[PDB]
Structure 1
Amino acid sequence: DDWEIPDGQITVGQRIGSGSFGTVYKGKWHGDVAVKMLNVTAPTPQQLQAFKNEVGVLRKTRHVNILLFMGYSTKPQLAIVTQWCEGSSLYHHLHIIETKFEMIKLIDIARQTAQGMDYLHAKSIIHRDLKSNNIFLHEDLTVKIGDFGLATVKSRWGSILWMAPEVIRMQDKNPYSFQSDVYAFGIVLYELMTGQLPYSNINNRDQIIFMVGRGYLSPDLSKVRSNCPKAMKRLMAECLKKKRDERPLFPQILASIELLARS
């Protein structure tokens, strides 16, 4: 039941940025692969725990819309090897190059993301940092949900715009939940339908945190493109509800999208 990659086989190449913990490179191992590795002499016991936790999470997943984990190595460095994604993140498409998707596709990118999040939740995985730059649009047609951090381009302002109000406040030692993820998804939906990030009219970062937490500030739903189906706008609204128990789970969401995915 083994996924260790023996030493000397992975050829580390270009250098892409910085992951959850380490540094991500473009590599070669039975084809193009992505290699996250801790560039250190000796791992700390906590660092080695992170590694174990991440390998433990990725090895539970086998789904077209989740980043394909291929193996790991511990022989010179700690290193996770995943598939290599071609193209760019949703964030880059929507907010950097201003890509011009047709609604039929915007809904598809939504549908696929919904599939992957449904899957993760099925296997008791809470993503905790879902956002558009963690959605790679592979080959320009296939969502691949990852946890890149800085492998792909970074968001405007941790990462504030996708945090549900209860996550922002930080009352509990753990405010994260299937529903915290659903709120995140709700903002991704907002991005897709508006083409924009939320709260464009505020330049102060602390003010956004304060207000979204207090439920004084909410995404401006009037900005959704006029050819966006009322089902999708209504669904967006239900994912963005401020009370978390009032948010739908993904089985429901996936249904709702699959429904409107005719006409």
Structure 2
Amino acid sequence: DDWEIPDGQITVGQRIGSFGTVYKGKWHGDVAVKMLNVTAPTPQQLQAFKNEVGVLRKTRHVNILLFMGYSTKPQLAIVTQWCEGSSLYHHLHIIETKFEMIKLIDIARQTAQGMDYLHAKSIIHRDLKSNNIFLHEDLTVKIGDFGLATVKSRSGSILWMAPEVIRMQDKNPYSFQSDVYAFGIVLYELMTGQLPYSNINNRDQIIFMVGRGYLSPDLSKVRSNCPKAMKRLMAECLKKKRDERPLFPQILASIELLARSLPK
């Protein structure tokens, strides 16, 4: 049964990330390792980690980063598949990658696909954002960094945070819809190739404004080749009240419907 990977069985290479630091390595080929790089967690910390891992093993889907095993000994770690490619953030916002409107819609679809899964598997991402969506072989969407919702509790996502989330209002804001609004942001990201509210330099003012929903994203910044129904859905996914947002079944429905009336 247990996916534990004993000491020496992994060989860590060059360094990548910086909530857990990410290393590339080799374990039956190239693999990603996120070492939690805490110092030495005591027996009831150990148990809650194993608890979070158990939420990963619940996952088997092409649009979901492949959980390949965890480590305890050398350090606490989660090993996944290594992706060839670059994050959706990196394409859109660093190397200014220009995607055909058709491939944009597919990435949308793929991403909504992965979510609809996690949601039926009663998972909530909590931090769905473009720097967290890989584009593999430049064709396949892999959602990641949604594990460990307990190990963190026990900043840099403000843009995707739904109102209810943003204003640190109650104990649990995070819903399925929370994730749905974060989707609306990635939708806007795709259809505009731009981060929202870029004409504002004072962070806190965003945080304030969104929280009160005086400031929402600017639909009218979508590139013209964006489908009429794509706009309608983006807007549907960004509604200020969370009960008004649709759930991934309906989102997926709407995407697969408009994409079929597209290349024609």
TM-score (norm 1): 0.92
Aligned counterpart in structure 2 of residue 159 of structure 1, from 157, 162, 165: 157
Q: Is the 8 A contact 1:20 1:149 kept in 2?
A: no
1:129 to 1:87, Cα distance in 2 relative to 1, 3 A: same
1:120 to 1:143, Cα distance in 2 relative to 1, 3 A: same
> Hey, what's the Cα distance between the residues in 2 that align with 1:98 and 1:152?
35
> Hey, what's the Cα distance between the residues in 1 that align with 2:50 and 2:152?
25
CA RMSD in angstroms, aligned pairs only: 3.7
Q: Is the 8 A contact 1:133 1:154 kept in 2?
A: no
* Deviation of the 1:76 alpha carbon: 2.5
**Number of positions where the alignment pairs a residue of Structure 1 with one of Structure 2:** 261
* Deviation of the 1:51 alpha carbon: 2.6
Higher mean displacement: 194-203 or 149-158:
149-158
1:130 to 1:155, Cα distance in 2 relative to 1, 3 A: farther
> Hey, what's the Cα distance between the residues in 1 that align with 2:182 and 2:28?
35
Higher mean displacement: 137-146 or 6-15:
6-15
* Deviation of the 1:78 alpha carbon: 1.5
What whole-Å deviation, never above 9, does each CA across 1:142-165 have from its counterpart, x for those lacking one?
Answer: 000011899999999741000011
TM-score (norm 2): 0.92
Secondary structure at 1:172 match in 2: coil
Q: Is the 8 A contact 1:157 1:205 kept in 2?
A: no
> Hey, what's the Cα distance between the residues in 2 that align with 1:152 and 1:51?
8
Higher mean displacement: 162-171 or 40-49:
40-49
1:149 to 1:217, Cα distance in 2 relative to 1, 3 A: farther
1:153 to 1:173, Cα distance in 2 relative to 1, 3 A: closer
Match of 1:85 in 2: 83
1:38 to 1:46, Cα distance in 2 relative to 1, 3 A: farther
What whole-Å deviation, never above 9, does each CA across 1:23-67 have from its counterpart, x for those lacking one?
Answer: 211000000001112335522457535532431221110000101
Aligned counterpart in structure 2 of residue 241 of structure 1, from 239, 242, 245: 239
> Hey, what's the Cα distance between the residues in 1 that align with 2:141 and 2:234?
19
Q: Is the 8 A contact 2:35 2:77 kept in 1?
A: yes
1:173 to 1:49, Cα distance in 2 relative to 1, 3 A: farther
1:84 to 1:166, Cα distance in 2 relative to 1, 3 A: same
* Deviation of the 1:214 alpha carbon: 0.7
Q: Is the 8 A contact 2:53 2:70 kept in 1?
A: yes
1:50 to 1:197, Cα distance in 2 relative to 1, 3 A: farther
What whole-Å deviation, never above 9, does each CA across 1:115-168 have from its counterpart, x for those lacking one?
Answer: 000000001101000000000011111000011899999999741000011111
Q: Is the 8 A contact 1:133 1:153 kept in 2?
A: no
Secondary structure at 1:245 match in 2: coil
Q: Is the 8 A contact 1:135 1:145 kept in 2?
A: yes
1:226 to 1:162, Cα distance in 2 relative to 1, 3 A: same
Establish whether residue 185 from structure 1 lines up as the match of residue 183 from structure 2.
yes
> Hey, what's the Cα distance between the residues in 2 that align with 1:61 and 1:142?
17
1:124 to 1:149, Cα distance in 2 relative to 1, 3 A: closer
Q: Identity over the aligned pairs, expressed in percent?
A: 100
1:148 to 1:242, Cα distance in 2 relative to 1, 3 A: closer
> Hey, what's the Cα distance between the residues in 1 that align with 2:220 and 2:232?
12
Q: Is the 8 A contact 1:24 1:35 kept in 2?
A: yes
Higher mean displacement: 182-191 or 86-95:
86-95
Q: Is the 8 A contact 1:88 1:152 kept in 2?
A: no
Q: Is the 8 A contact 2:52 2:149 kept in 1?
A: no
Secondary structure at 2:105 match in 1: helix
1:173 to 1:156, Cα distance in 2 relative to 1, 3 A: closer
Structure 1 residues without counterparts, runs of 5 or longer? none
Q: Is the 8 A contact 1:138 1:144 kept in 2?
A: yes
Q: Is the 8 A contact 2:128 2:146 kept in 1?
A: no
What whole-Å deviation, never above 9, does each CA across 1:214-261 have from its counterpart, x for those lacking one?
Answer: 110010100101111011110000000000000000000011101111
